[PDB]
Copies of this chain bind each other. A is one copy, B any other.
Amino acid sequence: GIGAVLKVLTTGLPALISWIKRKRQQ
C-alpha cells in the first residue's frame, strides 16, 4: 500500500531521473 510505494520512490526515483535524461540525449 502507500508505505512500500513511498519507499520505492525515495530510493528508486533518483536513478530513474538519470536514466531518462540519458535516454533523451540519445
Contacts and interface: CB of A to CB of B under 8 A. Distances in A.
B24 A2 contact: yes
B21 A13 contact: no
Given A4-B8, A9-B16, A9-B17, 12 more contacts: A1-B12, A2-B19, A2-B20, A2-B24, A4-B12, A6-B17, A6-B20, A6-B24, A8-B9, A13-B13, A16-B20, A20-B20
Contacts of A17: 6, 9-10
Interface of A: 1-6, 8-10, 12-17, 19-21, 23-24
Contacts of A8: 4-5, 8-9, 12
Nearest to A24: B2
